[PDB]
Design a protein around this ligand. Structure first.
Ligand SMILES: Nc1nc(N)nc(-c2ccccc2O)n1
Length: 285
C-alpha cells in the first residue's frame, strides 16, 4: 500500500539532512501547509540497502506516537523513493550539545521523553537499535522524538529475540556485539550510553577506533558516569549499563527513576537549548 505521484501533494524544498541512507529535504504538505521532511532514496543506486529501506518504511508506517517521527507515506517517483515524515526544526540532541554542556534538568527532560518513545516502541515489540543523541530530534518548541528507524527490529510470536549486528559501535550493547539473542533491553543499554553522552558530550571510548570498541565493550566492565554529577544521575546510568540485559530495567521502570522524577521539567524549557544552538550555529566558522 505504497503511494505514487508525491508532487501532487507535496512540494520539495531545500536539502536539510544526510546519512548514506540517501538525502533529506525540507518539504510542504500542500494540503495543510505544514512543513515535512522528505528522504529521497535512489533505488537504481543503493542496491542491497533495499532490505533496510523496506524495513524502515515498515516500522515507520506502524508507529503512531508523539514520541516517534510521524510518517506521512512512502512514494514512488520514477527511479526514486520518497519517504515523507515529520519535520522537526529544533535540531538533534547532538546538535544541542555542540555549544556547550547541558545541566541535569535538561538531561533529565530529554531522557524522560526518550523513555516515553522507548516505552511506546517496546510495547509494540519494536527495538530501535540505534539510540544515540543524533537520532533524538526536537521540534522548535522542545518536543522530543525518536528518529531514524533504518535498523529497527521487530519481535513476533515466532521470533522473540533478535540476533543482527546493527547499531553504532560506541552505543551498542555487549550482547548485540556478540550477536547473542537479544531484545528491547539492548535499547536500554544504548540509552545509558546516551545518558553519558548527554552529560559529558560524548559516549565512552569516543576517541578510539570503532573496531576497537567492538572488543572493548564485551570485555570491559560497563562504563560509569564519572565526574561531578548527582548521585541519581550516576545511578540511572549504572542501572542501564548492566552487562546482563535481564538486570537492566524497562523503559517504563526508568520513567519512575529518582533522577527523572526529581529533575525532569516541561519540554518547552528546552527552547532555551534550541535557541543556544541557533545562536551558536549562526556565528560559527
Ligand atoms: N531521519 C529523519 N527523520 C525525520 N522525520 N526528520 C528528519 C530531519 C532531518 C533534518 C532536519 C529536520 C528533520 O525533521 N530526519
Amino acid at each position: 500500500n505504497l503511494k505514487a505521484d508525491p508532487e501532487e501533494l507535496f512540494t520539495k524544498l531545500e536539502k536539510i539532512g544526510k546519512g548514506s541512507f540517501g538525502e533529506v529535504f525540507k518539504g510542504i504538505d500542500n494540503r495543510t501547509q505544514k512543513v515535512v521532511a522528505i528522504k529521497i532514496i535512489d533505488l537504481e543506486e543503493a542496491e542491497d540497502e533495499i532490505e533496510d529501506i523496506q524495513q524502515e518504511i515498515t516500522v515507520l508506517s506502524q508507529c503512531d506516537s508523539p514520541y516517534v517521527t510521524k510518517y506521512y507515506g512512502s512514494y514512488l517517483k520514477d527511479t526514486k523513493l520518497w519517504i515523507i515524515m515529520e519535520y522537526l526544526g529544533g535540531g538533534s540532541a547532538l546538535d544541542l550539545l555542540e555549544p556547550g554542556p547541558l545541566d541535569e534538568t535538561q538531561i533529565a527532560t530529554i531522557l524522560r521523553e526518550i523513555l516515553k518513545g522507548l516505552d511506546y516502541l517496546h510495547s509494540e515489540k519494536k527495538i530501535h537499535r540505534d539510540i544515540k543523541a543524533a537520532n533524538v530530534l526536537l521540534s522548535e518548541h522542545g518536543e522530543v522524538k525518536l528518529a531514524d528507524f533504518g535498523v529497527a527490529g521487530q519481535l513476533t510470536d515466532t521470533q522473540i529475540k533478535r540476533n543482527t549486528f546493527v547499531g553504532t559501535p560506541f552505543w551498542m550493547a555487549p550482547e548485540v556485539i556478540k550477536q547473542s539473542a537479544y531484545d528491547s533491553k539492548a535499547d536500554i543499554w544504548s540509552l545509558g550510553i546516551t545518558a553519558i553522552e548527554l552529560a559529558r558530550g560524548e559516549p565512552p571510548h569516543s576517541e578510539l577506533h570503532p573496531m576497537k570498541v567492538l572488543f572493548l565493550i564485551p570485555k570491559n566492565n560497563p562504563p560509569t558516569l564519572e565526574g561531578n554529577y548527582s548521585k541519581p544521575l550516576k545511578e540511572f546510568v549504572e542501572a542501564c549499563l548492566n552487562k546482563e540485559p535481564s538486570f537492566r530495567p524497562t523503559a517504563k521502570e526508568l520513567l519512575k527513576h529518582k533522577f527523572i522524577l526529581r529533575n525532569a521539567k516541561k519540554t518547552s524549557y528546552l527552547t532555551e537549548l534550541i535557541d543556544r544552538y541557533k545562536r551558536w550555529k549562526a556565528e560559527q566558522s
